[PDB]
Amino acid sequence: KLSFDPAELLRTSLNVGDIVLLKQCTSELTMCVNLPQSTTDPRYTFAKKDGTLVYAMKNSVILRIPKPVLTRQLIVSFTLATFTKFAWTQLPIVLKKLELIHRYLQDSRGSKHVNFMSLVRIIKNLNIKEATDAIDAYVRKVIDESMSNKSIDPTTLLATYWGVREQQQNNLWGSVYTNTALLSPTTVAVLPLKKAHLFYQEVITRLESNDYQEIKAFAKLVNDKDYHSIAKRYDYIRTLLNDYAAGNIEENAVLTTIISKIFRHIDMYRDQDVTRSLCGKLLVEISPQSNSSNFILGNWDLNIPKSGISSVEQKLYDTAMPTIVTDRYDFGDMPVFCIDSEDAHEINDGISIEELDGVRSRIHIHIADPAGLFPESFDYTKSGISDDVLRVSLKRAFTTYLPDLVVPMLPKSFCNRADLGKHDRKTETISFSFELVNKEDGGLHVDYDTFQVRLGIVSNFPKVTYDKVDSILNGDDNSLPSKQKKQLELLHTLATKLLHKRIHDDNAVVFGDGFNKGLVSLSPDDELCIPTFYDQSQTKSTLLVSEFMILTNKLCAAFFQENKIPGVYRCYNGLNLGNQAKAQFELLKENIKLGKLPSLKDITKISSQLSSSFYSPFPLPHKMIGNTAYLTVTSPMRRGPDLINHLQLHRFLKKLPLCFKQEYLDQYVWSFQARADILKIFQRHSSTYWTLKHLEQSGKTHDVIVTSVPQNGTVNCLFPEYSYARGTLKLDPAMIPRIGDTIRHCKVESIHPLDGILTLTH
RNA sequence: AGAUAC
Ligand SMILES: [Mg+2]
């Protein structure tokens, strides 16, 4: 065991024996020595080289290496020491490689990510002496050769991480993202030498010369409120403030000091902690009157198009057209229900039912077929991907949905063509058909032998929204044909039994009330700048739609496995938990069978025992949805995993050579999981920004629920009324509260929206 | 933190 397989990360959860890097101890190795014991305290116990323990949140783990009292302490310590030693020895050599291959990976035009693993492999497999010979070809040989085994050397891994954190300080690499489920790094940006490293070197130089004269000249202009000259003269400083508020340079400490000096020289801002919000306030103050300014949108990793690389790609997307334009089953005038919101972009799904008997119904799930618009759907002559629009699409591994804006994974042209829901238009689908039988027990049974996958056509699309459907199933609405209206009631009654089945039979875990309140929508102004809040609805139509997609996705799992097809699955492992905690958890899991579903107060206590879901190149149980594999196909225009599962289908159904061998898959799943993580983050970050910006506009008291153990006399908390208003409370020393506890009257200390900071007193 | 849709 000198190397390990990245796959054991997916197969395993955090467990004792794991060797970790913590956010606390980024420069010392640690090792998990105990798991959480209760809901009262859900932290893991880690041991340092010194035998000193550390208790930390599962998510404080930045990277993970999978697996007589004194002997145990001794072997724990000597192990950690050995790994550190061999790690340190490589490090001066690794820094040299990092600077070097940074020359080959960099793109001159903007930030560009790379799989962190692929990167580690290059570090290991590279000879500096051969790379410097006047016969480059070598380096490119090592990079392509990174694809093979796929095993990874832990010490090189550790050293590379350390090397990157070091060269991060020179604006050579972006942040290292650590996936929540695997607890391991996924990707890191490679920032351009001239546009970021070098630019900020010249900035620092020009600002410190003649004892910070230009800092001084600038701060004067600000105090004299002459914003005009700032524009002509000091735009490089606006840039700097911008890169701080957006979160691009928040890790370069020189620049933070520079910024401290500037605030120190400005009257209003002089005494205040240097926070992105504060850079935002200033930058707003010295820039022409806007209506809103979400600066998170400037973030390089969020990677919205602004000049750059993505600005190049959208120049293609704007003029791209799916001229790839044949043996499909036609469903005729059979009606297809596309139950989406009024404010929807991509219509990926439709439902059709045929009532055959009182006992039996046949179901058709018509998924848009974006895979069809590309030569790769059918072309067995060329292995891999030749197409521009397709490579780009897979790079934007999902559509980016934010309260501010949306960035579709696919071009507008391809979306109009592939979209469902266009009435009386012959519309290509991929359709999954099967039959359900009502069972004697009142239950329901699914005939997998009915299950069928076909390339179809549909054209009869009833106009429907989750609301219209709901008012229909209440009787409020009767604008629909009685034949159509009854297919809905039938579908709704089928889902109810599907859901009841998933709970009692698949031991699925399904959430109750309160879980998605105060979500964020922008409203426009006298410009989308007004936040309005809502709850995600759990209704008859959502229940209907959801139950079927879940089922569709479960079945393609079965299909891909039985036919030995490489697919992108979505998995969920859960946590390794202490025996007393596993009972606190299990006690809640029987409550869902019995009829009570968990409250968010109840979930807060449980939330300290949950994992997150992750994509995988091979089947693993998604242990929430049920006890079985799960492969997402229902949203091929907005999820890359689904989109890839479709190209495999096109190949298979036309009995062609498949598009992807299993090896090409692991590379993409890494690419996808990376982009998935970034998006979860920036979704939370922006909505938080807006939750807080509203709490600012609204003006001192609110009720909260405790969500953490006191660390330095302070707890984490959340607002029941708002999902993205998470803060910290300074506990009153006069008295300690448990997790899930409510505190009704609380004083607001500070609010920093661009930073996500919310502070309170009791 | 799970799920669906977007
Ligand atoms: Mg829909």
Author numbering: 89 to 155, 190 to 257, 260 to 272, 275 to 432, 434 to 452, 455 to 655, 658 to 830, 832 to 867, ...
Sentences from the paper on this structure:
To understand the structure and mechanism of the yeast mitochondrial RNA degradosome, we present crystal structures of Dss1 nuclease and the mtEXO complex of the yeast Candida glabrata (Cg).
We then designed several deletion constructs and obtained stable preparations of the Cg-Dss1 protein with a deletion of 69 N-terminal residues (Cg-Dss170–900). We also introduced an inactivating point substitution (D477N) in the active site of the RNB domain to prevent RNA degradation during crystallization. At the N-terminus a β-barrel domain is present (residues 92–170 of Cg-Dss1) with a patch of positively charged residues facing the RNA-binding channel. DALI16 search revealed that it is a winged helix (WH) domain. The second domain that is unique to Dss1 is a double HTH domain (residues 320–419 in Cg-Dss1).
